Design an enzyme around this catalytic site. Structure first.
Site, short mmCIF file in Angstrom:
data_model
loop_
_atom_site.label_atom_id
_atom_site.label_comp_id
_atom_site.label_asym_id
_atom_site.label_seq_id
_atom_site.Cartn_x
_atom_site.Cartn_y
_atom_site.Cartn_z
N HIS A 92 0.87 -1.17 0.00
CA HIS A 92 0.00 0.00 0.00
C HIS A 92 0.90 1.22 0.00
CE1 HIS A 92 1.06 -0.78 4.15
NE2 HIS A 92 1.13 0.53 4.21
N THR A 196 2.89 1.47 11.37
CA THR A 196 2.66 2.93 11.40
C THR A 196 1.20 3.30 11.48
OG1 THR A 196 2.55 3.17 9.02
CG2 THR A 196 4.74 3.33 10.02
N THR A 197 0.32 2.30 11.60
CA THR A 197 -1.09 2.50 11.92
C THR A 197 -1.43 1.66 13.13
OG1 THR A 197 -1.84 0.67 10.49
CG2 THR A 197 -1.70 2.86 9.50
#
Ligand SMILES: COc1ccc(C[C@H]2SC(=O)NC2=O)c(OC)c1
Ligand SMILES: [Zn+2]
Length: 258
Positions: A92, A196-197
């Site tokens: 992504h 990172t999420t």
């Protein structure tokens, strides 16, 4: 959980539901090129994507994911800082509203227009869900995007985006070759970090390539036409879906190159 990238639910709020947000190995980070040290012990990096089998592309309301068949060792990352074999599960991007922002990692505080994440899991843990509970569970290959010439290998992705505009939409996405997203050089920086999420798990060996890829203004403009919202909801453009740099704390960033 109703996390996102807005004023009211963005990165500054994540720590309330996910306290590991203020942990000791959070990502992304600024890569200070003058502090990162060449490590002669790093083995060669091996990106083995010849048998990659893409399946589907999904707008999940945070980004769009290109998903791969990871039921066997079809597309793997090995070598570099890695022990063993890491299986490609998805890629992504993170991107900006403007060309001067969008990347998660920064290089001497420089923000790129976007950042590509190719997510792999350590096959010694048997499945992805188990791998994310381990400190060496994932290897994410990060590639910076700058705006210049078009990337031909990206255009198949750009052209399907109209069909997955809103959260929860997916489309068949077979026979996509992720090798067309790589730069020429595999020189990299590496450090131990996190997702990172949310859930922000501290399970990632980050491998960030030094050489950005170039994409066209038209290509990144089409990323910015995606929506965070679901169908029939008020339009919220999918832009600025990046977490800013987090404290390095007691970590060293190693370079693969002199
Ligand atoms: C539960 O395991 C995971 C693993 C990876 C992601 C993707 C994250 S991690 C990254 O580097 N960039 C991202 O967007 C995730 O998102 C919910 C959840
Ligand atoms: Zn990512």
């Amino acid at each position: 959980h109703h996390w996102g990238y807005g004023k009211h639910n963005g990165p500054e709020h994540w720590h309330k539901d996910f306290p590991i947000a203020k942990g000791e190995r959070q990502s992304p980070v600024d890569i200070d090129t003058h502090t990162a040290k060449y490590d002669p012990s790093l083995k060669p990096l091996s990106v083995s994507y010849d048998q990659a089998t893409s399946l589907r592309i999904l707008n999940n309301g945070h980004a769009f994911n290109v998903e791969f068949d990871d039921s066997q060792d079809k597309a793997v990352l090995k070598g570099g800082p890695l022990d063993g074999t890491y299986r490609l599960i998805q890629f992504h991007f993170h991107w900006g509203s403007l060309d001067g922002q969008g990347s998660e990692h920064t290089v001497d505080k420089k923000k790129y227009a976007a950042e590509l994440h190719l997510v792999h899991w350590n096959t010694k843990y048997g499945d992805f869900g188990k791998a994310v509970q381990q400190p060496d569970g994932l290897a994410v290959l990060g590639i910076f995007l700058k705006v210049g010439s078009a990337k031909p290998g990206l255009q198949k992705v750009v052209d399907v985006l109209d069909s997955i505009k809103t959260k929860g939409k997916s489309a068949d996405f077979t026979n996509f070759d992720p090798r067309g997203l790589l730069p020429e050089s595999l020189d990299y920086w590496t450090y131990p970090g996190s997702l990172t999420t949310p859930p922000l798990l501290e399970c990632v060996t980050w491998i960030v390539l030094k050489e950005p890829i170039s994409v066209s203004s038209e290509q990144v403009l089409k990323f910015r036409k995606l929506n965070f919202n679901g169908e029939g909801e008020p339009e919220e453009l999918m832009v600025d879906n990046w977490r800013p740099a987090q404290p390095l704390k007691n970590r060293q960033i190693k370079a693969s190159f002199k």
